[PDB]
Amino acid sequence: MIGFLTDWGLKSHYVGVAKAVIKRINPSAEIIDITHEVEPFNVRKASHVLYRASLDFPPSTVFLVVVDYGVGTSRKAIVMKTKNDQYFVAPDNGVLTVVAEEYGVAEIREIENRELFYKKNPSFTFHGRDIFAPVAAHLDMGLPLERVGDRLLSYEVLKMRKPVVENEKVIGEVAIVDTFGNVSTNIPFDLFLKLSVDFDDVVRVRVGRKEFKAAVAKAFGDVDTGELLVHPDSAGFLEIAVNLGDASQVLSVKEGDEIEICR
Amino acid sequence: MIGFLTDWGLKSHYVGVAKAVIKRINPSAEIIDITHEVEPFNVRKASHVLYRASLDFPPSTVFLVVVDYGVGTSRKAIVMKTKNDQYFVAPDNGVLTVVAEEYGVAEIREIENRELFYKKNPSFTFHGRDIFAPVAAHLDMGLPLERVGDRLLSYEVLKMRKPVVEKVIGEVAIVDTFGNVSTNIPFDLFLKLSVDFDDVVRVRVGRKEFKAAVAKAFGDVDTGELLVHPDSAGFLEIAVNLGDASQVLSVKEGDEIEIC
Amino acid sequence: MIGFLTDWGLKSHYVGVAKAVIKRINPSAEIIDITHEVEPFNVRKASHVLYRASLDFPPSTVFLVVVDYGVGTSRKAIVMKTKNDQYFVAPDNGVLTVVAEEYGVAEIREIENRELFYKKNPSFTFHGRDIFAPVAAHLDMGLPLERVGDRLLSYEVLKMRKPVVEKVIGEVAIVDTFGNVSTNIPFDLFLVDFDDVVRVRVGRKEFKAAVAKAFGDVDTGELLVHPDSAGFLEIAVNLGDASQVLSVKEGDEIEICR
Ligand SMILES: Nc1ncnc2c1ncn2[C@@H]1O[C@H](CO)[C@@H](O)[C@H]1O
Ligand SMILES: Nc1ncnc2c1ncn2[C@@H]1O[C@H](CO)[C@@H](O)[C@H]1O
Numbered sequence: 058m059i060g061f062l063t064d065w066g067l068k069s070h071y072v073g074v075a076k077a078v079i080k081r082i083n084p085s086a087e088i089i090d091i092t093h094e095v096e097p098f099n100v101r102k103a104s105h106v107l108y109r110a111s112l113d114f115p116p117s118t119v120f121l122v123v124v125d126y127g128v129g130t131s132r133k134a135i136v137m138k139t140k141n142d143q144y145f146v147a148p149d150n151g152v153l154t155v156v157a158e159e160y161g162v163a164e165i166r167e168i169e170n171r172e173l174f175y176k177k178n179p180s181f182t183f184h185g186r187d188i189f190a191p192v193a194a195h196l197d198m199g200l201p202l203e204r205v206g207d208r209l210l211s212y213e214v215l216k217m218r219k220p221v222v223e224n225e226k227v228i229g230e231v232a233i234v235d236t237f238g239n240v241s242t243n244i245p246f247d248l249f250l251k252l253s254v255d256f257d258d259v260v261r262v263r264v265g266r267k268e269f270k271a272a273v274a275k276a277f278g279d280v281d282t283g284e285l286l287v288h289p290d291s292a293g294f295l296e297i298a299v300n301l302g303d304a305s306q307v308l309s310v311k312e313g314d315e316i317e318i319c320r
Numbered sequence: 321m322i323g324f325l326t327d328w329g330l331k332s333h334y335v336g337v338a339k340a341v342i343k344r345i346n347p348s349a350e351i352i353d354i355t356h357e358v359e360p361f362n363v364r365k366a367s368h369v370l371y372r373a374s375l376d377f378p379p380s381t382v383f384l385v386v387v388d389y390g391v392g393t394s395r396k397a398i399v400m401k402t403k404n405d406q407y408f409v410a411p412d413n414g415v416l417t418v419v420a421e422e423y424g425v426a427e428i429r430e431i432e433n434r435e436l437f438y439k440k441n442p443s444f445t446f447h448g449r450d451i452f453a454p455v456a457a458h459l460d461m462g463l464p465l466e467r468v469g470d471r472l473l474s475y476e477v478l479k480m481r482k483p484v485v486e487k488v489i490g491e492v493a494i495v496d497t498f499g500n501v502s503t504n505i506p507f508d509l510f511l512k513l514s515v516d517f518d519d520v521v522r523v524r525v526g527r528k529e530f531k532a533a534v535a536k537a538f539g540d541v542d543t544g545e546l547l548v549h550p551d552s553a554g555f556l557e558i559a560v561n562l563g564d565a566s567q568v569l570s571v572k573e574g575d576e577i578e579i580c
Numbered sequence: 581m582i583g584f585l586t587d588w589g590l591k592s593h594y595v596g597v598a599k600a601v602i603k604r605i606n607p608s609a610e611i612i613d614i615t616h617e618v619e620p621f622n623v624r625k626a627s628h629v630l631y632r633a634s635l636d637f638p639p640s641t642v643f644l645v646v647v648d649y650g651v652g653t654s655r656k657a658i659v660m661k662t663k664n665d666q667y668f669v670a671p672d673n674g675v676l677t678v679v680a681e682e683y684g685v686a687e688i689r690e691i692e693n694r695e696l697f698y699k700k701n702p703s704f705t706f707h708g709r710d711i712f713a714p715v716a717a718h719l720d721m722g723l724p725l726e727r728v729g730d731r732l733l734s735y736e737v738l739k740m741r742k743p744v745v746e747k748v749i750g751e752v753a754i755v756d757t758f759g760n761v762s763t764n765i766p767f768d769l770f771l772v773d774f775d776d777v778v779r780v781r782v783g784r785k786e787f788k789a790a791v792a793k794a795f796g797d798v799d800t801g802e803l804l805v806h807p808d809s810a811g812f813l814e815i816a817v818n819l820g821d822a823s824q825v826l827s828v829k830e831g832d833e834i835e836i837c838r
């Protein structure tokens with residue numbers, strides 16, 4: 058199957074034309090949209106969403122990831138193979154930073170085989186349709202990776218301050234704010250569990266100059282309606298939520314904001 | 321096939337990983353999204369959307385319904401088979417109220433067979449992915465109902481105000497993209513008011529009253545005018561031709577409406 | 581395959597039931613959503629989106645186009661085949677204006693064969709589900725065009741001002757999610773050369789913009805004029821929102837001077 062992730066939006070016809078190109082190449086291709094609502098050009102956000110979603114896709118899955126503000130420039134178009142046997146077709150702009158770091162890099166190829174393109178002369182600003190989609194389509198069809206082009210020894214990496222445990226607390230950043238307003242950080246709940254904390258404990262969540270108390274719980278309903286809670290999200294990350302409410306509003310936080318959780 | 325309905329939104333990756341899990345259990349599963357934009361936690365809205373959508377799905381359809389604010393709590397995870405031969409995989413929180421009342425209940429099973437789960441250790445807040453989705457996939461693929469778990473004799477029901485005639489009185493059930501206001505009032509029940517097409521009735525919402533023409537199509541009235549008619553599911557719906565009824569009437573779902 | 585375009589939105593269950601209907605007629609039907617977020621009743625916007633998307637769909641593609649404010653009225657329901665071998669199932673309200681003009685019309689049939697319907701008695705306001713969807717499904721299965729109904733020798737046309745060159749002038753056709761402003765001006769006509777700086781006039785205000793190939797060819801936040809993925813001249817702000825910066829909306833007149 059092909060996992061599809063972009064910042065194109067479902068309002069425009071861009072997603073549909075890319076799917077048409079894929080289906081023209083392989084009528085039997087299975088395309089699963091991860092999301093097409095990544096905020097415009099937000100590669101940092103996309104890198105996180107990609108990793109978390111990839112955890113639920115099987116080995117051999119080909120991911121079409123296109124959040125490409127540098128489309129048409131000298132930035133490289135690449136295909137990465139992670140040590141967990143998954144494939145990623147994307148621009149070399151750092152969007153593959155998290156999967157590369159979490160799964161390990163097995164091999165990286167630059168897309169040079171023009172025979173895999175949808176058009177002889179790709180549009181200057183829509184490589185997603187003319188280069189990335191068809192390449193993902195061919196790979197998902199059995200095309201050997203080596204046929205995409207020559208290997209690369211490096212790839213662009215997004216500078217990120219790794220979440221660490223230091224003196225009774227864990228420091229990190231807000232990675233994703235979902236539809237409910239739940240605030241998921243880049244702090245692994247396992248890392249958080251090294252602060253010798255447990256469900257039913259109460260910890261302090263610090264955002265900027267504010268400090269909130271929050272119960273460590275398993276489910277939203279484990280606290281009264283409207284109350285804050287700290288729990289592990291579906292991908293194993295520490296998330297802050299408000300039962301039947303919006304944590305991003307209560308904390309007044311947005312993606313990228315530094316967040317601290319004291320024991 | 322599988323009818324998918326949630327309050328997860330299409331912006332998050334939640335819907336995609338759920339479909340991936342389903343596709344992993346059954347590569348040829350046909351998944352049709354009813355909607356994933358149900359307002360967060362709004363089980364009442366979902367209960368109506370579910371029923372109206374189900375009317376166009378064939379018998380044997382397995383519906384995956386997940387608007388589950390109680391995920392991870394003691395609330396039951398169930399599978400309901402209605403008398404019209406449709407199956408519903410959902411939390412026991414009242415979201416299946418309308419399909420239960422309209423189609424009647426044939427059987428109810430509590431999801432207990434852990435071998436039907438996606439992961440050995442289900443997440444505390446994403447049963448949609450770890451329990452409901454895979455169970456819906458297995459069911460849509462043949463799995464006998466008895467393989468789900470023990471039977472249940474009752475299910476949580478959403479308290480509702482059954483629409484009656486005496487004028488007609490009901491509630492706004494769904495406000496769609498266009499702002500059309502669909503009620504829980506069957507258009508047939510309304511016709512038992514000696515009313516007829518072309519007649520002008522009065523719409524009473526809150527403390528305001530409007531004049532509305534009984535018509536068949538939006539274009540049967542001048543642009544911007546209010547009309548009362550049967551929507552695609554047989555329910556009385558109020559709309560503004562080339563306009564937004566919800567804005568004009570300044571009404572929201574759950575709102576009580578009166579037609580004299 | 582079927583290209584699906586409407587103004588129904590993805591929030592409502594309408595799109596879903598329409599797809600269920602297509603699938604019941606043909607379980608193997610391949611449905612590709614072009615968009616369901618066309619502004620309500622905006623047939624003009626839909627006509628441009630339909631054409632631009634259709635350029636990337638193969639011949640023999642069946643397009644289900646339903647932006648039908650006149651649903652339930654005397655407006656005709658039709659099936660149009662264009663000379664580029666694509667089929668369009670839609671209301672006769674001008675939504676097919678652009679594909680008809682750009683590709684040329686091969687034939688038009690009024691939908692009269694009721695055996696192609698979803699139900700004997702179609703709803704008054706959801707022909708998308710009861711008439712258009714099933715018809716598109718059948719055509720996609722190989723149903724001969726002559727089996728749809730009788731031929732029509734005309735169709736409703738949305739009058740439109742054609743862009744020119746004298747500096748060139750045109751109108752904003754589509755503003756995408758990024759805020760990029762795509763016009764109805766073919767970038768070929770426009771072709772001045774890349775790297776030159778031109779003037780963009782949007783009513784009373786004027787802006788300077790670089791003619792470039794990639795958004796990144798200018799500095800962050802700067803304006804550029806380039807060909808979009810369909811070949812139309814588009815105005816964009818690198819890493820920004822041109823629609824906001826230019827304070828323009830679809831339908832607005834746009835001028836570009838050397
Ligand atoms: N105005 C813009 N500035 C920079 N990048 C853009 C702009 N519009 C679209 N893109 C990028 O084009 C890519 C698709 O080719 C998208 O992933 C998007 O990030
Ligand atoms: N902050 C929250 N409070 C209560 N329920 C929630 C919250 N966030 C998500 N959910 C529920 O989790 C379910 C998915 O597991 C969704 O159907 C949603 O209703």
Ligand SMILES: Nc1ncnc2c1ncn2[C@@H]1O[C@H](CO)[C@@H](O)[C@H]1O
Nearest residue numbers: 538560561562646647648649705706
């Ligand atoms: N209030 C309304 N006025 C006019 N047309 C409408 C209204 N609501 C829905 N429609 C049309 O009904 C069609 C679907 O049957 C849609 O394409 C939409 O344009």
